[PDB]
Amino acid sequence: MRVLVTTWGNPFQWEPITYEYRGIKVKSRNTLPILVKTLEPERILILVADTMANYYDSGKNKPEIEEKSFSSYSEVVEDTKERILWHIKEEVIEELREEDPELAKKIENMLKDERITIEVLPGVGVFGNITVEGEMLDFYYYATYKLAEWLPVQNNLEVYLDLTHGINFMPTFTYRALRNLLGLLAYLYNVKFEIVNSEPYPLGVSQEIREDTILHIREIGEGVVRPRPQYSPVEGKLYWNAFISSVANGFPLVFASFYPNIRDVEDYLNKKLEEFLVGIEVGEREDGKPYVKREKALDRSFKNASKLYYALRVFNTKFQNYPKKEVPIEEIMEISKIFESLPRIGIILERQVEWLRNLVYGRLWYENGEQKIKKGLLEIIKDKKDKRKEAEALKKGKTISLAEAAKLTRISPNVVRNFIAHSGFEYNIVYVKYDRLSDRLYFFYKDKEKAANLAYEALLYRGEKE
Template identity: 25%
Template sequence: MIYITTWGDPSGWGEATYKKENGSEVKSFSTISTYDNASKIVIITLDSVLTPQKQQNQNPKKDNVANSCARKIASDYPTWVNNVKDYVKCIAEKGKEGIPISVIVIPAIGKISDFYYGKITLNIGSLPSYLYTQIVEALLVHSLYNELKDSNEEIVLDTTYGINYLPTITFHVLYNLTSLLGLKLKVINYIPTIFQKEYSFAEILRKGEGYFDLNQIKEKKSEPNEGKADIGKRIFIRSLKYNAPLLTLKICQNTVGDSKDYYNEFVNSVKISDKNEIIIQKKLDPNSAWIDVIYDYVCNKIKDYKNTKEGIEKIGNEIFSKFSSIAPSIISWELNSIYSIAIKENKLNIGEEKKYSEIAEKYKEEENSNMEEMRRHLKYFINCPELFKEYIKVERVDDKTLHNIVIKYKEEENSNMEEMRRHFIAHAGLLKDYIKIKRIGDKTLSLDYDESAIKGLKNILDLKNEDLEKILYNKK
C-alpha cells in the first residue's frame, strides 16, 4: 500500500496512543507509525512549517522530535522548499524507518509567525486569492501523478492532520487520479477518544477503480503561435470526450507533448521579499495540469498500438473504459460492424483500401429525424430575419418561404452540428463518410481518417485555427 498523508505544523505534536485497524496499539508522535504495510509514504505539507506560530506555555517535551530535525529558513525559495522536505522527512523517519518517504511542499497562505505567505502577484499587480486553490490543485495533480503513475497498489489517504482545506483538495485530486490509473482508494482518520492522548482508527471511505469524469475539465482556448503539442493535447481531450479511439491513437502517434514540470517551474518563480513576504509570481491552471497528466498516461500506454481493429478495440477496453462504462461496448460494436462488412462479406480484397461508405450498405435516414430541432432554429430566424440574410436573399421571412428556408438551412454546414456530434459519439468516431479501411491480411483491417473528412472533423470537434491535417498525418 502507498500511504498519503497531509501534515500541518508538527512542531507541537506530542506522544499519544494510536489504536490501529487490527486493534493493536502503538505509542508515537504521529499516525505514521501505524503504517505497517506501507511500501511508500507520501507526505503533503506547507512551506510554512519552518516558521511555526509561537505558542504560549508550550510544553517543551512536545517538540523534541521537531527540534532535533530543525532546519533554517532560506533567502531563496527553492532552498527553502528543500529545507522543508529535509525537515519533514527527518521527522517522519523517526516514526517509520526503512520505508521510502516523499515530501510534497505546497504554498501556505496568510500570516504565520513573522512571515506573509501566498501573496499572489504578477505584472498586473495583486491577483484574487481564489487562484491559490487552483495553484495548489495543479501542484498536487502533477506531483501525485508522478508518485503514483507506475503503481498498482491500493492508495490510503490519511486525513488525520492538515489545515482544513488541504485534506479536502488532496482527496479530490486522489479520487480522480485513482480513477484514471485504475487504483483503489481508502480514506482513513484517527479520531481522538481521549483528547491528545488516545486516537482510534476509522475508515471514512473505500473506493474501487471508478470512472474519471471528463466533463470537469475545461479546455483552454487556442492561442496565437501555439505549438503542435498544445494543439494536439486540446484535440486529444476532445477525442476522449467524443468517444473516438482512432482519433486518440492518431494524436498520440503524431504529437510529442512532454508533461510540463509544474512543480519546479512554480518553485523557481516564487520570491522572498525583504519584508518576509513569500510572493507567488505564477498562475497555474489545474485544467491544463489534468490534460497533461491524462495525455501522458494515455499516450505512453497506447502510442505503439496499431490502428487495426484489434488495436483500436484494445484502446476502448483499456482507456475509454476509464471514462465511461458503455464506451467499450460502442467501440466494439462499430468495429465488429466494419469487420463484418469488409471481411465476412468480402467487400475488400487483401491490399485494397476504400472509404467505409463505399463498402457499406446504403442506409436510409428517417425523414423527420431532426425536424423538431430544425423548427426551433427556424422559429428563431423567422423572428430575427436580419440574422438570416446570409442564408437567403430576402428582406423578411414569412410562411411562404418556409419550405425554401428549410432546404437552404439543411445545406448549411453547421445547421445540424449538435446532431452530428451525437452521431459521431454514438458511432465511436467511425462514421462511414470519414473512415477509410484497408485489408492488410486475411482477417486483419487497418483504419484511418480519409483526408476528405478533415473539414467535417474540424466542425464536429469545434476546432478553429488548429491544423488538424498536420496532427493526423504528421505533416510539417
C-alpha cells in the same frame, strides 16, 4: 501493491497520543506509525506546505535547525523538507524506540530506501515563522501534478489517503486530485481507494481524561474505484483535447490518431511549471521572517495537463505504437477493450466495433436455423471478378470512404451528436485503405483537423433540458 499518501500540517504542534486501528494500538505524535504497522505500505508520499519553512519552537527548542534567511523558493522548499525530515527521525522514530522498537527500525529502514518521500507544496498563510502569499488553487493544481509523477501504474493498486494531519484547505484538494487520477488508472487496472482519518486530538481536558482517550483511525473511503469520464481540456491544445475527449467518450479511432507523445506534454508541464516558480518572490517581513510571495499562478490547464500526463502513463503500459494515423481493425478492438471498465460505453463500442470487424471479414450469422452470410472488403479484394469501381479503386490501394465500404457489402444535422453516437466513426470522414505489402485494411481520418474539432466539441457538449 499498497501505497500511502498522507497530508501533514505542523508536526511540532502535536503531542503524543495512542492510536487504534484494525485492532492494533500504537502511541505517537503522528499517525504514520500506526498506519505503517497496520498497512505495511510499499511506499509513502508525505505532503506538506511551504508554510512549514523556517519553523522553530523556542520553548521546546525544536526542530534543532536554525532560522535562516532565504533568497530563492528553492531553498525554502529544501528547508521545509529538512524540518519535517527531522520530526520523523528525532521524534517519530526516536519515541518509538520505547514503544515498538521493531517499528522504529522498519520506519528507519523505509527512510533509507526511497520508500517514503516528502514533497513540498505551495501553501497560504501568515504564520509566526513565515508568511506565504499566493493563490490557494496552486496547492491543488500542483498537487495533481505531484501525484501524477509519484503515483504507481499497476494492477491491484491500493491507495490509502490519510487526511488526519491535513490542516486547512489541503484535505479536500488532495482528495479531489487523488480520485481524479485513480479514476484514470481504473480504465485498465483494478485499484482500491481508501481514506483514513483519525478522531480529533483531545483538547482542553484534564491529563487524566486525555490518557483514557484512544483515537480511532477511521476508514471513510469509497472502496473499489470506478473509472469516471473527465471533461478536462488543456487550453490551446486541440489534438490533446481531441484525445482527452476520446478517453472520456470512447472514440477508438480518435484515441489512436491523436495519442499525444508523453514527452510533448511532459515538456508542457515543465515549461508552465518553470514559469510559475520564477514568479515566486522570496523576501523578508517586517519582523525578519521569510516572506514568500507568488506573483504567478497555475491554471486548470496545468491540472488537466497533469491529468493527461498520468493517463498516458497508464495507457503507455499497453500502447506504444501510437499515435497512428492508419490503424487496422485489430487495434481498434484493443483500444475498444479499454472502455470495458465503463460498461455503458464499452457495450456501445462492442456492437459498433463488431460491425467494423464484419466489414473487413464478412458477417456469418443465423436466422431461424437458416444460415446466411456476407463477405468483407478482404474477400472482395481477392475475387478477381468484382469490377465494381469501389472494389476496383480499393484493389489498386486507392482510398475509399467508410460509406463506400458499406456499399461494396452490407451495413441528423447535428454533427457533434452523430459523431458521439457513432463513437467517432462517421461514414463521411472515416476512410479505408488496403495495403498489399502488410496485407491489411486500415481505417483513418482523412480530414485530420475536422476529426479533432468534432472530437474536441464532443467534450464540451451538453444535451438540452430547458
